[PDB]
Amino acid sequence: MRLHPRTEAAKESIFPRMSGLAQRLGAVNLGQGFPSNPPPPFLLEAVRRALGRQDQYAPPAGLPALREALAEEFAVEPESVVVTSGATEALYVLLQSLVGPGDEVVVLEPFFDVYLPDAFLAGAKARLVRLDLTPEGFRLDLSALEKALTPRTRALLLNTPMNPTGLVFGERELEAIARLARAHDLFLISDEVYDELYYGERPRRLREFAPERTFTVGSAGKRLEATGYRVGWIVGPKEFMPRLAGMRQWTSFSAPTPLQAGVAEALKLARREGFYEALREGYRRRRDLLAGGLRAMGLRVYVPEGTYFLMAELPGWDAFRLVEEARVALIPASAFYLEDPPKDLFRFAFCKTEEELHLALERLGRVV
Amino acid sequence: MRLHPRTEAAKESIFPRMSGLAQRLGAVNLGQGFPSNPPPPFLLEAVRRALGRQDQYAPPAGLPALREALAEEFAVEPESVVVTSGATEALYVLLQSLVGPGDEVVVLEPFFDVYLPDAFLAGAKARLVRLDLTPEGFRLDLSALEKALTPRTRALLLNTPMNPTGLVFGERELEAIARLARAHDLFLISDEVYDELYYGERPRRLREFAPERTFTVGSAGKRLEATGYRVGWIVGPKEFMPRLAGMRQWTSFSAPTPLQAGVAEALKLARREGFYEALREGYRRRRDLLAGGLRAMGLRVYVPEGTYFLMAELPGWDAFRLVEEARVALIPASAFYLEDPPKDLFRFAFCKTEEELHLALERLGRV
Ligand SMILES: *Cc1c(COP(=O)(O)O)cnc(C)c1O
Ligand SMILES: *Cc1c(COP(=O)(O)O)cnc(C)c1O
Ligand SMILES: CSCCC(=O)C(=O)O
Ligand SMILES: CSCCC(=O)C(=O)O
Numbered sequence: 001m002r003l004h005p006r007t008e009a010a011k012e013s014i015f016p017r018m019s020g021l022a023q024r025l026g027a028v029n030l031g032q033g034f035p036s037n038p039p040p041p042f043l044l045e046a047v048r049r050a051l052g053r054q055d056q057y058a059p060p061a062g063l064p065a066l067r068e069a070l071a072e073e074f075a076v077e078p079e080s081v082v083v084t085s086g087a088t089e090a091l092y093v094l095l096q097s098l099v100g101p102g103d104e105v106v107v108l109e110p111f112f113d114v115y116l117p118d119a120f121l122a123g124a125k126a127r128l129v130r131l132d133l134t135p136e137g138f139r140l141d142l143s144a145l146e147k148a149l150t151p152r153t154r155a156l157l158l159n160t161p162m163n164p165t166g167l168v169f170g171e172r173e174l175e176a177i178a179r180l181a182r183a184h185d186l187f188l189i190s191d192e193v194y195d196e197l198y199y200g201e202r203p204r205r206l207r208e209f210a211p212e213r214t215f216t217v218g219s220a221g222k223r224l225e226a227t228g229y230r231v232g233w234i235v236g237p238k239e240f241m242p243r244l245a246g247m248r249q250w251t252s253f254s255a256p257t258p259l260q261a262g263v264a265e266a267l268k269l270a271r272r273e274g275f276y277e278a279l280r281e282g283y284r285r286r287r288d289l290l291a292g293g294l295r296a297m298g299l300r301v302y303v304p305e306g307t308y309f310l311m312a313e314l315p316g317w318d319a320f321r322l323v324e325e326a327r328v329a330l331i332p333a334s335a336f337y338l339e340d341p342p343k344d345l346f347r348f349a350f351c352k353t354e355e356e357l358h359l360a361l362e363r364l365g366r367v368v
Numbered sequence: 369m370r371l372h373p374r375t376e377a378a379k380e381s382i383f384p385r386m387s388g389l390a391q392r393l394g395a396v397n398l399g400q401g402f403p404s405n406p407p408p409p410f411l412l413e414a415v416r417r418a419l420g421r422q423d424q425y426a427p428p429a430g431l432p433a434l435r436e437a438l439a440e441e442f443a444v445e446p447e448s449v450v451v452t453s454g455a456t457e458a459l460y461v462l463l464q465s466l467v468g469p470g471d472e473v474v475v476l477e478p479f480f481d482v483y484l485p486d487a488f489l490a491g492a493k494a495r496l497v498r499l500d501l502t503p504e505g506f507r508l509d510l511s512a513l514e515k516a517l518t519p520r521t522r523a524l525l526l527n528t529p530m531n532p533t534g535l536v537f538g539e540r541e542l543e544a545i546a547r548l549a550r551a552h553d554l555f556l557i558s559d560e561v562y563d564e565l566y567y568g569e570r571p572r573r574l575r576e577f578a579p580e581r582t583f584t585v586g587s588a589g590k591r592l593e594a595t596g597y598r599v600g601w602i603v604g605p606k607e608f609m610p611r612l613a614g615m616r617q618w619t620s621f622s623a624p625t626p627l628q629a630g631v632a633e634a635l636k637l638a639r640r641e642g643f644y645e646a647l648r649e650g651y652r653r654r655r656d657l658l659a660g661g662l663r664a665m666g667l668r669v670y671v672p673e674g675t676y677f678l679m680a681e682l683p684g685w686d687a688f689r690l691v692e693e694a695r696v697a698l699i700p701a702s703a704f705y706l707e708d709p710p711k712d713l714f715r716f717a718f719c720k721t722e723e724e725l726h727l728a729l730e731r732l733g734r735v
Contacts, residue, residue: 001553001581004468004490010614016427034424044419047626052412056402056595085453085598085620092619100372117618122372129662154372185369226423228625230453230598243371243578246378250485251460252453254384256624257596258415259685 004028009117014335018230018319021327028360031165031242033309033328033349036128036356039226047262058257059193060249061241062233065264070233073267076264080238083260085252087193087219087232091120093247094215094234098187100126104152108140112163112191126338127153131165133342137302138165142176149180155187156180158206159367161194161328164311164336164347166304168203178210185267186213193232196276198306199284220263224270225279225351227257284358286350293361297368308351313344314364322346326367328360370685377485382703389688390697396728397696400675401717404724407594409434415630426625428617429609430601433632438601441635442575442584448606450613451628453620455587455600460486461615462583462602463525466555467492472515472520473545474626478704480531480559492522496706497535505670506533512546517548523555524548526574530703531561532679532715534672539572556582561590561600564644566674567652580605588631592638593647597627651676651718654725658718661729676719681712694735 015032021031038044054063061067062083084090091114098107101123107115109128116126116271127148131138156177160169165222169177181188190206195218207214215236221227230328232255270276291301291310300313311333314322319332333345350357383400390397396428406412406443416427422431429435430451439446452458463486467473473487487494496514500507513524525546529539537545549556558574575582583604589595600623602612616622638644659669659678668681679701682690687700718725 001555003465003608006468006470007465007611007615008612010465010617012610012614013617016425016617019428032425038420039423047419050415051415052406055407055593055597057384057387057400058596059388060381088621089453097375097378103372114618121618128469154369187369189399228422228426228622229426230620230622230624240371240573243375243378243382246380247375249381249384250377250456250482250489250620252457252598254596254598254625255622256598259624259627 002134006121009120010362013113014331015113018323018329018331021323024329025323027323027327027329028356028363029329030349030352030356030360031331034227034352035225035351036353037040037225039224040266040275042138043224043226043262043266043272044056046265046269047258050258050261051260054257054261056257058254058260059121061245062254062259063257063264066260069264069267070235073271074235076235077238080235082234082241082248083255084232084234084248085255086221086230087191088114089251090217090232090234091115091189091191092121093244093251094189094217095119095124096277097244097247098155098189100354102152103154104150105336106145106148106153106156110164110333110341112159113335115157116338124154128338130337131167138167142171142175148179149184149186150364153184153186155189157189157191159191160203160206161304162196163194163307164309164331166302166307166309166311168198168200169206170306171204174204174206174209178206178214181210181213188214189217190214191217193217193222194307196223197280197283197308199287200305201308207235220267224263229256229263231255231259231263244283247337263350283351286352286354289354290348290350290357290361293357299366310348310350312346312348313342314346315344317344319346326363328363374489376673377488381481382699383481383586386687386691386697386699390691393691395691395695395697396720396724397697397730398717398720398724399699401416401558401719403593404720405591405593408634409447410641411592411594411630413639414633415626418626419567420631422625425624426622426628428622429613430623431625431628431632434628437632437635438603441639442639444603445606448504448604448609450601450602450609450616451615451623452602453623454589454598455559455585456482457616457619458543458585458602459483459557459559461612461619462557462585463487463490465615466557467522469470470520471522472518474516474521474524476525476527477706478532480527481703483525484706493520494603498705500602501710506535508537508541510541513545513548517552517610521552521554521558522666525557525559527559528571529566529672529674531562531675532677532699534670534675534678536566536568536571536673542574543577546574549578549581554581558582558584560584561587562593562675564649565648565676567655568673571674575603588635591644592631592634597624597631599623599627599631654695654722657722658716658725660727667727677715677717679715680715682714683712685712685714694731696731718722
């Protein structure tokens with residue numbers, strides 16, 4: 001008796017693997033992304049208030065309260081919102097409902113750890129499109145993007161703000177995509193879990209330009225510093241939504257109720273108390289600190305416009321040697337690139353305390 | 369642009385759709401099974417202690433504490449335990465790991481609405497194996513079981529205490545089933561979310577007869593009256609575990625940290641405080657009460673051995689036409705069987721207050 005060949009895709013993600021390596025080595029974890037602080041008090045109290053009164057099942061699509069709250073933020077009706085057990089389940093169930101054997105899916109590179117595996121588990125094939133790493137940071141070359149479409153291609157998967165690059169797609173760029181989308185009738189899947197986490201002008205969502213074909217993915221845990229709550233969501237044309245609620249219902253049924261209840265209150269409060277504004281500033285401060293401290297170490301640093309990840313190049317090192325000898329953990333570029341990853345490109349996470357970032361800066365320092 | 373054909377199965381499940389109808393109609397919801405009371409105090413307290421301390425990502429396989437708590441209850445080691453976002457995810461991930469294009473999966477009948485869709489979504493066939501229905505009650509047939517076994521069969525999928533029959537499989541039958549599996553070199557998927565909800569005698573576990581190929585599935589929701597916590601588990605041979613964690617990794621990454629944290633303490637407190645003991649007590653009453661009350665009316669009632677459900681026969685009736693006039697929710701057998709499902713067989717659910725049980729009978733009587 002042997003497992004089905006499909007299970008060849010079930011390999012320990014690099015993120016949780018390095019997190020274990022770090023505790024074991026007493027290293028500073030700047031790898032897997034998750035805040036070192038607890039989530040805001042209003043979320044915790046909202047969850048506390050839900051325990052003992054909203055502990056049982058919830059409609060597969062989500063608690064009405066949560067849907068209504070997402071509806072307002074997005075300016076859509078409740079029917080167009082489906083609450084999943086994390087953005088992770090949103091992405092899996094999405095690809096699952098949009099591609100299959102013989103179908104192609106464009107995926108920008110470097111990509112996010114869950115895409116390819118999700119694609120493969122659906123049957124589709126990865127149409128990687130490597131962004132250029134010019135001395136001014138990454139950038140999408142629409143020509144190279146365009147040269148990658150075919151009669152098979154049934155969908156395009158975007159990530160903005162982008163993990164791990166930190167790139168924020170600009171208006172003109174989104175047009176070009178919503179455009180190409182329509183031209184070949186391609187589906188649009190936008191991973192925007194970091195929608196509220198940007199450091200410049202407020203980005204323009206992608207559903208604006210190509211509403212009829214856009215699926216926008218978000219995460220409560222990436223919004224409210226509570227990555228362990230597993231409450232995510234899909235927002236797209238209401239006609240398809242009912243099926244998606246059908247899919248995710250076989251995968252896990254519905255998200256945790258008391259957590260769905262708490263996030264519901266928390267999303268509205270957050271919009272009223274200016275929580276996202278403060279969070280962004282707290283992140284910009286730590287972004288500049290890390291990037292600035294690395295700069296002083298004559299390293300090449302590519303300042304991000306969004307998310308709490310940043311990319312730098314450390315000459316002549318590799319994750320596993322760095323974690324053991326410098327006591328600092330990082331995610332190696334080869335985790336995002338399917339082939340030939342820019343040697344010496346590492347990803348730093350700065351959703352940590354100022355003291356952890358400094359500790360990393362000092363340890364990396366005396367290891368010239 | 370159209371959604372991939374696979375979505376054929378992505379059809380709203382009956383249970384949440386009937387609860388919406390029941391609710392909306394002001395009808396007693398003895399359909400979808402979920403307790404009317406809140407989870408025990410020691411589970412809420414423990415979750416509360418976790419909020420603020422354990423809110424970030426846990427490992428895909430699960431929180432060390434939880435895996436260890438389960439490891440002790442099942443007499444195995446942590447590595448053979450993988451925590452899932454509810455049992456529902458156990459099943460999905462499971463069937464998706466043992467069968468694909470070309471494989472077949474034996475399934476008993478009546479079934480749990482998740483079974484075929486999963487098999488279906490796995491790209492494999494799921495030949496059924498209906499059970500009998502003598503006056504005594506349901507009945508298994510190792511013969512039919514023995515027959516459905518073809519060369520393409522990769523695994524069987526048991527479920528005891530069985531939902532929706534309340535049937536608690538006996539030792540000789542498990543063992544009998546164990547034999548088949550080892551002979552044909554099959555996998556055994558045991559859905560045991562109701563392992564602690566039995567009205568009879570401490571039921572034996574399949575894994576005691578074929579521990580080398582049996583995957584046991586459980587659920588904190590069913591054990592602890594907290595169905596919305598979405599914390600479940602798969603306990604199987606350690607050699608296959610690293611893979612199962614890798615599959616669920618891609619589905620929902622890992623279960624809710626605070627809930628996993630709280631369930632971990634609760635599983636231990638439960639044994640100690642004799643919680644399960646008493647949970648079985650109160651479920652007995654409500655079991656007897658709801659069935660006797662149906663005899664007084666004069667119907668065919670099958671007193672279950674386990675679970676908090678129970679099936680009965682309602683003369684020339686159906687589903688929606690009931691939740692409209694009688695204003696009481698029930699589940700028609702059409703959801704458990706694929707074709708030609710028994711006449712007038714409706715599954716209730718007595719995990720409600722005594723009040724709700726009574727008030728459900730009244731509205732039943734005047735019809
Ligand atoms: C964190 C992350 C996810 C997953 O979010 P969850 O809600 O934790 O499952 C998906 N996509 C990207 C790009 C992420 O950074
Ligand atoms: C409740 C139930 C499930 C699902 O359990 P979750 O932990 O809520 O996902 C699966 N199988 C049976 C027989 C059940 O009764
Ligand atoms: C869900 S694993 C971690 C995902 C993430 O935020 C990361 O890119 O580190
Ligand atoms: C499929 S959600 C409901 C699960 C359950 O307990 C039931 O069968 O009623």
